[PDB]
Curated annotation (Swiss-Prot):
Changing residue 115 to D: Significantly lower binding of phosphoenolpyruvate. HAMAP family: MurA (MF_00111). Pfam families: EPSP_synthase. One of its GO terms (cellular component) is cytoplasm. One of its GO terms (molecular function) is UDP-N-acetylglucosamine 1-carboxyvinyltransferase activity. It comes from Enterobacter cloacae subsp. cloacae (strain ATCC 13047 / DSM 30054 / NBRC 13535 / NCTC 10005 / WDCM 00083 / NCDC 279-56). SUPFAM superfamilies: EPT/RTPC-like. This is UDP-N-acetylglucosamine 1-carboxyvinyltransferase. Phosphoenolpyruvate binds at residues 22-23.
């Protein structure tokens, strides 16, 4: 089982090129199921999920290939079924649903173990599709979707903000007859990205980024070239990497505007931040971060995906800072790990009271959450001694060559195979 053996402390500084957001690449990849013409999705990170999606797309009759881009030709999609073996490791698979039913009047996606599709009293995906006119069936380990003719625009009010379902409904509504208005729409930069992708295909979408998305269905989507937006969480991870190490870092291929809350938080922590059109610079001026108050909340508020990183920040910051989760109330597995590294924290309800210490200590740590895991690698970078982060395949899944990235930042990191 791969592990990251990090030797600290090392100042993390220099430059990093931010990869495209898997979180945007994914829905865009599925959205490409709508395209009748070739589509080139640029800036797609090389991550397992992308491969799994490619494999899934191909299974559907999609002609797929990749490098920095993923080339998609969904012109001939003929199979409307995402099979078990193809979706088993990837929840994102539900994304094949809306496009399939929207474009082909039918679609189905396997529901492997752990798959909570349809488990909610109101499954947003199902709900939105249903609102669009699709008949949703939960049968034979499958979520099945069918619509006689085309989907119909609908005024859809999402009972909860759902990135996943927002993508599904927005995507599907692009081919629906009429106007679809999604209320309480997820505001994630990834939603905006997917919508913009769609628009590039000829879809009519407005409001992306706001709580209200309005899609004017079109008969067909063509193709085009679309560049996946920068990974805001990777960016944030890198910014934090410098913030917690007295470093100066320039994030290339970044999109500052997806990170308002995070950058503001960083300034609070004492970071000297500058931003350009495609870059973010973070300079600690060799300074230890100042403890900050963090409260995760739906985008554009502080992202829970940055939560562990900021916990780490607080953990080596000056002063006591509180990390509060309003999204994943128990998303604190990194804490006991960090405590083994000398961090001082109390997990109280949905919060972590962080007592910043000057220096962490290497330890053998493991967090299954990718952010927590990356946070641990970061901690190892700044910790005294050797830190072994176990199960880093988690990181591998959500970060494109974080090892290479960190190394280029000055980290003493080594991928250790097995033991």
């Amino acid at each position: 089982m791969d592990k990251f053996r990090v030797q600290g402390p090392t100042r993390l500084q220099g430059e990093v090129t931010i990869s495209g957001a898997k979180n945007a690449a994914l829905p865009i990849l599925f959205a490409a199921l709508l395209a009748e013409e070739p589509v080139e999705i640029q800036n797609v990170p090389k991550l397992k999920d992308i491969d799994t999606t490619m494999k899934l797309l191909t299974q559907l009759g999609t002609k797929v290939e990749r490098x920095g881009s993923v080339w998609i030709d969904a012109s001939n999609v003929n199979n409307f079924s995402a099979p078990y073996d193809l979706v088993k490791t990837m929840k994102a698979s539900i994304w094949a649903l809306g496009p399939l039913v929207a474009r082909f009047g039918q679609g189905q996606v396997s529901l492997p173990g752990g798959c909570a599709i349809g488990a909610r009293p109101v499954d947003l995906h199902i709900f939105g599709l249903e609102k669009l006119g699709a008949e949703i069936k939960l049968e034979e380990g499958y979520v099945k979707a069918s619509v006689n003719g085309r989907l119909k625009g609908a005024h859809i009010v999402m009972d909860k903000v759902s990135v996943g379902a927002t993508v599904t409904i927005m995507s599907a509504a692009t081919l629906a007859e009429g106007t679809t208005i999604i209320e309480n729409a997820a505001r994630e930069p990834e939603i905006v990205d997917t919508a913009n992708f769609l628009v590039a295909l000829g879809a009519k979408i407005s409001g992306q980024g706001t709580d209200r998305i309005t899609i004017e269905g079109v008969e067909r989507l063509g193709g085009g070239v679309y560049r996946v937006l920068p990974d805001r969480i990777e960016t944030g991870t890198f910014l934090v990497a410098a913030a917690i190490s007295g470093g100066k870092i320039v994030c290339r291929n970044a999109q500052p505007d997806t990170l308002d809350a995070v950058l503001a938080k960083l300034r609070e922590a004492g970071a000297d931040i500058e931003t350009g059109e495609d870059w973010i610079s973070l300079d600690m001026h060799g300074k230890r971060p100042k403890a900050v108050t963090v409260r995760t909340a739906p985008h554009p508020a502080f992202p829970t995906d940055m939560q562990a990183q900021f916990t780490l920040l607080n953990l080596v910051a000056e002063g006591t800072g509180v990390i509060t989760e309003t999204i994943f109330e128990n998303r604190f597995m990194h804490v006991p790990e960090l405590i083994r590294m000398g961090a001082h924290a109390e997990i109280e309800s949905n919060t972590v009271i962080c007592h910043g210490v000057e220096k962490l200590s290497g330890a053998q740590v493991m967090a299954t959450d990718l952010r927590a895991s990356a946070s641990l690698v970061l901690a190892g970078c700044i910790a005294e001694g050797t830190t072994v982060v176990d199960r880093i395949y988690h990181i591998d899944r959500g970060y494109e060559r974080i090892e290479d990235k960190l190394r280029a930042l000055g980290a003493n990191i080594e991928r250790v195979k097995g033991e």
